[PDB]
Amino acid sequence: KETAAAKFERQHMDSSTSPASSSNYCNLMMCCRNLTKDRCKPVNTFVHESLADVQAVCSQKNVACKNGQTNCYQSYSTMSITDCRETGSSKYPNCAYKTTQANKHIIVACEGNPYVPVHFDASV
Amino acid sequence: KETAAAKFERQHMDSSTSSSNYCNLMMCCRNLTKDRCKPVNTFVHESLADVQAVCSQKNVACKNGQTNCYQSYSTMSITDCRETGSSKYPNCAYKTTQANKHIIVACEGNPYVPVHFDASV
Ligand SMILES: OC[C@H]1O[C@H](O[C@H]2O[C@H](CO)[C@@H](O)[C@H](O)[C@H]2O)[C@H](O)[C@@H](O)[C@@H]1O
């Protein structure tokens, strides 16, 4: 007869394999989004909030951009994001990244009509 | 030529709300849809040793009052499964949501191991 402990393992345990682990999220996404095609992009950030919530940032807190322009905006609240940073052994075309999930305000630059995000400037 | 807005979406967006068929398949493979659709379930993605170790972490009260519940000191990778509105046995359908949260389990036995999933917080 199935033991209570085995029933809990059947109902609730599914330990991730290494390829399916979140630690490998960046390696997969940086490749699938074509950010490693010509060389390894050093750092990148993915935002997991809805597109509506990210586009809304263009009407939130105006802050200075790192480059000096004034079309940057910081979200009023933190957002779910994943930060990808190239590992020391990374070497194009075998790009390799460390993945870090976090909750931070984002800063993007906006442009256009409609005024929407066109550059990701920072997380904070 | 890809627009600037499109390039931003491709480089930076990965919106979590609309493993999409993960729950559909895991619920059926673990026999949780055999006679009826189980309405909700949670799967934990840490190692079995790390989950069993929770039985000696923070002792807390279970939702029903039992004193044998334990909360993980650290958050854990889990997936929550919830039946959608279209779901209907024998065509059970689930929404899959990934999270990183502390888990609470009730433990019993010798060795003292989890026997019930009580909550995630
Ligand atoms: O089975 C996974 C779910 O476990 C908990 O929810 C169940 O157990 C609770 C305590 O007995 C009940 O109150 C609840 O109605 C059950 O569905 C947990 O709270 C859920 O988050 C898990 O998905």
Protein model, in words:
Two copies of one chain form a homodimer. The first copy, chain A, is 18% helix and 33% strand. Chain A is α+β, with helices and mostly antiparallel strands. Chain A has one domain (1-124): P-30 Protein (Roll), CATH 3.10.130. Chain A has a four-stranded antiparallel sheet with strand order 2-3-6-7, with no helix packed on it. Chain A has a three-stranded antiparallel sheet with strand order 1-4-5, covered by helices on one side. In chain A, a hairpin with an 8-residue loop joins strand 2 and strand 3 (72-74). Chains A and B meet through helix 1, strand 1 and strand 7 of A and helix 1, strand 1 and strand 7 of B. A molecule of 2 linked components (GLC-GLC) binds at residues 40-42, 63, 80, 117-120 of chain B.
Count of β-strands of chain A: 7
Oligomer: homodimer
- Level-2 CATH architecture of chain A: Roll
Termini of chain A, distance in Å? 53 Å
Side-by-side strand order of the widest sheet of chain A? 2-3-6-7
Question: Any idea how many domains of chain A?
Answer: 1
CATH topology of chain A: P-30 Protein
Summarize the helix and strand pattern of chain A as letters: HHEHEEEEEE
Q: Please, how many helices of chain A?
A: 3
Shape of chain A: flat
Helix fraction of chain A by DSSP (H/I, runs of at least 4): 10-25%
Largest interface: A-B, 37 and 37 residues
Helix/strand class of chain A: alpha+beta
Radius of gyration of chain A: 19 Å
Largest sheet of chain A: 4 strands, antiparallel
CATH class of chain A: Alpha Beta
PDB class: hydrolase
Keywords: 3D-domain swapping, bovine seminal ribonuclease, non-covalent dimer, antitumor activity, quaternary structure flexibility, protein mutations and evolution, Endonuclease, Glycation, Glycoprotein, Hydrolase, Nuclease, Secreted
Assembly: dimeric
Entry title: X-ray structure of the ligand free non covalent swapped form of the A19P/Q28L/K31C/S32C mutant of bovine pancreatic ribonuclease
